[PDB]
Design an enzyme around this catalytic site. Structure first.
Site, PDB file in Angstrom:
ATOM      1  N   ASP A  23       0.923  -1.200   0.001  1.00 24.49           N
ATOM      2  CA  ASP A  23       0.043   0.019  -0.113  1.00 24.49           C
ATOM      3  C   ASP A  23       0.805   1.194  -0.067  1.00 24.49           C
ATOM      4  O   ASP A  23       1.381   1.808   1.015  1.00 24.49           O
ATOM      5  CB  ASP A  23      -0.946  -0.050   1.088  1.00 24.49           C
ATOM      6  CG  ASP A  23      -1.771   1.214   1.245  1.00 24.49           C
ATOM      7  OD1 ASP A  23      -2.014   1.803   0.248  1.00 24.49           O
ATOM      8  OD2 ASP A  23      -2.519   1.471   2.328  1.00 24.49           O
ATOM      9  N   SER A  69      -0.766  15.772 -12.002  1.00 28.70           N
ATOM     10  CA  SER A  69      -1.070  15.247 -13.382  1.00 28.70           C
ATOM     11  C   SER A  69      -1.267  16.614 -14.006  1.00 28.70           C
ATOM     12  O   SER A  69      -1.845  17.611 -13.662  1.00 28.70           O
ATOM     13  CB  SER A  69      -2.360  14.579 -13.372  1.00 28.70           C
ATOM     14  OG  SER A  69      -2.689  13.938 -14.683  1.00 28.70           O
TER      15      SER A  69
END
Length: 330
Positions: free
Chosen positions: A35, A199
């Site tokens: 994770d 992004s």
């Protein structure tokens, strides 16, 4: 040193991925959920409340000659999906894919929430976010990667998750045969303890690319792609009959649909998520309403590039002094 381990979807939907991890001496192999959005290595154990264990493999520290109680240390964690676990702490030898760390904090669960109990395939979590998020008190502990880093050939690990197929976690090297083209690197902020990056925009299907900054985290422990409501609405508007259902808990779409792809930007590069990766199947057995793999982050407080996005790429988690993230197509 290096390590290399195969990671395998737990079910037909790729809801999560498990990777075998050797703990203790002799080795006890547990299948852990790696994770990158958390920083605790915790396991089902001989100390876990018996009624909360249902099929998991447990770590039994009393059977490990290298286990030592970390006296006074406790841990307690709550995840974004509302699940939780807590317990006490041992140090022991932990190996992943041939890479060994001695003295790793292994957090033994005394209690786990129902979601964990109900998932027989996940024996615990191995956190790969920054150690500043580790929950052990009163002495915070380091992640497996942080402990291994100095010994690694290069201070990196890579995630290469499969779509409906196994993939690979590598530590200490970049497998140049595992991706196509070049890797595009992008800046990381560690201010919130995550692999947080920005992004450069998105496209829906064959549509034009929208240049817009989207801050979010690269999180292998989250199944879906969670993005701003504006972006998610633009995606689902291209699917006839799709709608947001408050009763179901997100966007659903007719199972008869063909889903468009979704592209996200990494600098000037582009990662394309095929439409099929966005299908999470019937909302309940036999239903013709299917659950979407792109959902709104509104009310989470952060955008999450979970498995839906990451499995479309070869992803480099660069833990150099100034960390960065790399993405390549594959």
């Amino acid at each position: 040193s290096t390590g290399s381990a195969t990671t395998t979807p737990i079910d037909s939907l790729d809801d999560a991925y498990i990777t075998p991890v050797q703990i203790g001496t002799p080795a006890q192999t547990l299948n852990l959920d790696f994770d990158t959005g958390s920083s605790d290595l915790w396991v089902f154990s001989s100390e876990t409340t018996a009624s909360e264990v249902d099929g998991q493999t447990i770590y039994t520290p009393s059977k490990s000659t290298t286990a030592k109680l970390l006296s006074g240390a406790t841990w307690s964690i709550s995840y974004g999906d509302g699940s939780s676990s807590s317990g006490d702490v041992y140090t022991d030898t932990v190996s992943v894919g041939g890479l060994t760390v001695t003295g790793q904090a292994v957090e033994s669960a005394k209690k786990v929430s129902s979601s964990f109990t109900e998932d027989s395939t996940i024996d615990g979590l191995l956190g790969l976010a920054f150690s500043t998020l580790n929950t052990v008190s009163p002495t915070q502990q380091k992640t497996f990667f942080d402990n291994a880093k100095a010994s690694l050939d290069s201070p990196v690990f890579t995630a290469d998750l499969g779509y409906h197929a196994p993939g690979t976690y590598n530590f200490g090297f970049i497998d140049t045969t595992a991706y196509t083209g070049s890797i595009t690197y992008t800046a990381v902020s560690t201010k919130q303890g995550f692999w947080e990056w920005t992004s450069t925009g998105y496209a829906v299907g064959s549509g034009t690319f929208k240049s817009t900054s989207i801050d979010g985290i690269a999180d292998t422990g989250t199944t879906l792609l969670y993005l701003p409501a504006t972006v998610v609405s633009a995606y689902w508007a291209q699917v006839s009959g799709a709608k947001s259902s408050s009763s179901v808990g997100g966007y659903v779409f007719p199972c008869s649909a063909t889903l468009p792809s979704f592209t996200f930007g990494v600098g000037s590069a582009r990662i394309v998520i095929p439409g099929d990766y966005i299908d999470f199947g019937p909302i309940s057995t036999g239903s013709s309403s299917c659950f979407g793999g792109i959902q709104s982050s509104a009310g989470i407080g952060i955008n999450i590039f979970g498995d839906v996005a990451l499995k479309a790429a070869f992803v480099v988690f660069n833990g150099a002094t100034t960390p960065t993230l790399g993405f390549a197509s594959k």
